[PDB]
Write a protein that binds this ligand. Structure first.
Ligand SMILES: NC(=O)C1=CN([C@@H]2O[C@H](COP(=O)(O)OP(=O)(O)OC[C@H]3O[C@@H](n4cnc5c(N)ncnc54)[C@H](O)[C@@H]3O)[C@@H](O)[C@H]2O)C=CC1
Ligand SMILES: NC(=O)C1=CN([C@@H]2O[C@H](COP(=O)(O)OP(=O)(O)OC[C@H]3O[C@@H](n4cnc5c(N)ncnc54)[C@H](O)[C@@H]3O)[C@@H](O)[C@H]2O)C=CC1
Lengths: 427, 425
């Protein structure tokens, strides 16, 4: 951070990321509050975590108890004595009940207001710690097994660059993978744009988690794509995702390798043809739409519709901060990454009726060749303009993706998560 | 100094409202295809120069786009005409409510428009702004419920609202007698009105016809009177957090306005900033009671006893902090998020009653609170598409829009007044 003096800004924390074997948090886990979530959670987490009743690894506050605004007082009461003591890369997570689904307008106003609290707290925490807010459906059984994959993601190192965000967990029950640390056992994952960078790193994480990977990219990038299929011990496939036959070409490679079925499609492939709209041509527009919006929509509709992905399936789409906030010279790109959010939202119910979830991740600043292509100052500032005071890592994106792919993340659909370090930019 | 030079700024002097001035600086071009282009042309022919110099406004009807492949319309309409848009120009994309589209394809496409409008907002020059308005696919072709929004957007009043998203329902609208005197013969309770913003809301309201009831605490008795006199409404000393609060206003509505008011503005607000690990009960509880508990207690009270009824208008003051959060403000942002909470939550109940409740989240506004160090002041000021802080009028203008009698199909809305501030969620 070579402009720490120029911007009045702290040296970054080295963010603890996932390592197999290591405990998930670096301290004890406090689970406070009141409502329908504290008891069952204390219960589901007994074994794998380190429950009170030194340094706090995690702090979970149960807000579902809070039925009027006068009760918000709780957040204060619970958090004020314990922040003094949160560890390196701590994890604060507040849990509430889906505000639209509340039993009174009064309840709704308090549960809604939670985000103000969490997004603000995210701005006060030190040494790499983060905040998250999760809403659970008031029609979830009290065991609340549907909430588990999410708590486990946040209450760990994998969520290392996921800060200040809001999770939205449905009503369905969930079933834990035999092994949480190999959650993707014998799953077939399709990952587009997997030659290098974020796509490639998705494949890795997927493989690490148990999946067999179909690495898709174009002929231009074989060698780099070969090196990837190899490393995850999966299978390469040369394909332009915008071409008539693409759906046919994936289905068949599946038929020849995986019994014609898949569990996970990751729409990662993408291009950028930046230019101001006053200077934008038809070609710089169209190309970006084809790859970035038209294709992922086609592959989802294609592969679900032809039965390649069925029950228990998972689609994760690659969005962007640009699609939420906008960006100079990216009206194409940001239409497409906003459309991606639209695919996620538009298809969630339909796919829900088919036992399939669909979610998007919207990366912020990630070290890739592409951030590396930006004038160093503009680049250095961008990298540093977040609560976590640093650029994100391609692993951090893939993690959030892998959390969506989880067989126990079945109750989580239509969600949009930024992997952004709590970047300041937003809508 | 060096960083500033490195990065590359020319804030335009923003045109504001002036009685008499035309509402644009140039002619209005209405393009695109769909159920909005023909009616909008016809509604606006009188007061605007439609295309048979440079463009004062551009409006692209996007309701016509039903699949992603047709997004290309945006590019075909805007690219050619962009280079010709004037100082403080205006760009507005009208679309179909995504959640209510007739296919998932449409939904994808109409949802996609926000990425476009927010980015375009970031490329416009010379103080010009972009806006996205979605209209219920259930509105009648006449589209009468849309006008108030279009007329506010396509005017100088909306000078500091940039890059936003407006949500118009199905209901029909009757226009006021005088578009320049919209609030004529309306009674408006404006809390926190002694100084700054609240005091300016009261002005803009007078300008617009309203009989204002300027409200405040006793300690600010002096400044209230000045305000009350300036606008030609009457004053009321009361602390909004008093258990008698509702009853006192109600009493006053009898004494003066037939036990009746049409608009409520929950402007009164306070701060008490503290890192949460130093937060004491006073600082938590004070703000909470003033910023969240109070506003609700007034709204629910004044609709409950019938003081505000059919045709009513509650407008609450959120904040950027409530959307994006902010260091030292867990208490404060909890409240302003709760204000959105009040707005989203009370909207269907009030809809059924003939009342619209909406919210406004100011960005950075030149005021007496903003007492902030020149290091933080200079950055929050300039970190938005428009390269400056906003004037209080900019905020009150937006409130005045909601408050229109013609804004009956506008409810549940949270509109930031931030000249597209960079910070958000
Ligand atoms: N910092 C970043 O790099 C960020 C990236 N984005 C998005 O994340 C995703 C991955 O990021 P990057 O690694 O930078 O993506 P990228 O632009 O480097 O491309 C990903 C891969 O897609 C492949 N590709 C392009 N067109 C294809 C096609 N028609 N068929 C098959 N493959 C094709 C390319 O060969 C490339 O290897 C992209 O959607 C990108 O837009 C999102 C946020 C930030
Ligand atoms: N940049 C800005 O100015 C921003 C302002 N805010 C909001 O705008 C609103 C007012 O704006 P400002 O003029 O900057 O604040 P302010 O503090 O200058 O407004 C003062 C008014 O609040 C009144 N007040 C405080 N407690 C009261 C009570 N209990 N009962 C009756 N009146 C009471 C004071 O008497 C005074 O009339 C506040 O709600 C604030 O949260 C929103 C975004 C940022």
């Amino acid at each position: 951070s070579f402009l720490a003096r120029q911007l009045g800004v702290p040296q970054p924390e080295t963010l603890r990321r996932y390592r197999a074997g290591e405990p998930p948090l670096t301290g004890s886990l406090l689970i406070g509050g009141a409502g329908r979530v504290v008891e069952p959670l204390r219960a589901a987490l007994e074994k794998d975590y380190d429950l009170v009743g030194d340094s706090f690894g995690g702090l979970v506050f149960d807000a579902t108890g809070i039925t009027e605004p006068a009760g918000l007082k709780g957040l204060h009461e619970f958090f004020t004595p314990v922040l003094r003591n949160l560890g390196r890369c701590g994890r604060v997570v507040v849990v509430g009940g889906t505000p639209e689904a509340a039993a009174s307008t009064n309840e709704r106003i308090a549960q809604r207001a939670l985000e103000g609290f969490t997004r603000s707290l995210g701005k006060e925490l030190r040494r790499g710690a983060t905040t998250a807010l999760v809403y659970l459906s008031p029609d979830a059984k009290p065991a609340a097994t549907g909430l588990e994959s999410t708590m486990r993601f946040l209450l760990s190192a994998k969520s290392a660059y996921v800060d200040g965000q809001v999770f939205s967990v449905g009503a369905d029950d969930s079933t834990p993978p035999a092994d949480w640390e190999k959650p993707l056992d014998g799953k077939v994952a399709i990952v587009t744009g997997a030659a290098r960078g974020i796509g490639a790193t998705i494949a890795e994480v997927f493989a690490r988690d148990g999946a067999h990977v179909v690495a898709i990219d174009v002929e231009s990038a074989a060698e780099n794509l070969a090196e990837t299929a190899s490393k995850v011990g999966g299978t390469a496939l040369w394909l332009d995702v915008t071409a008539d036959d693409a759906v046919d070409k994936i289905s068949e490679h599946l038929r020849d390798h995986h019994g014609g079925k898949a569990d996970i499609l990751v729409n990662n492939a993408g291009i950028t043809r930046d230019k101001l709209l006053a200077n934008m041509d038809d070609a710089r527009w169209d190309a970006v739409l084809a790859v970035n919006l038209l294709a992922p929509l086609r592959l989802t509709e294609g592969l679900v519709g032809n039965g390649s992905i069925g029950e228990g399936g998972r689609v994760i789409g690659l969005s962007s901060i640009a699609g939420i906030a906008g960006n100079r010279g990216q009206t194409n790109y940001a239409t497409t990454k906003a459309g991606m959010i639209g695919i996620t939202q538009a298809l969630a119910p339909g796919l829900a009726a088919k036992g399939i979830t669909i979610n998007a991740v919207a990366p912020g600043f990630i070290e890739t060749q592409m951030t590396a292509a930006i004038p160093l100052a503009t680049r250095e500032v961008g990298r540093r303009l977040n609560s976590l005071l640093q650029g994100g890592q391609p692993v951090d994106v893939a993690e959030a993706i892998a959390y969506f792919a989880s067989p126990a993340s079945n109750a989580v659909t239509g969600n949009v998560i930024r992997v952004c370090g709590q970047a300041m930019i937003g809508a």
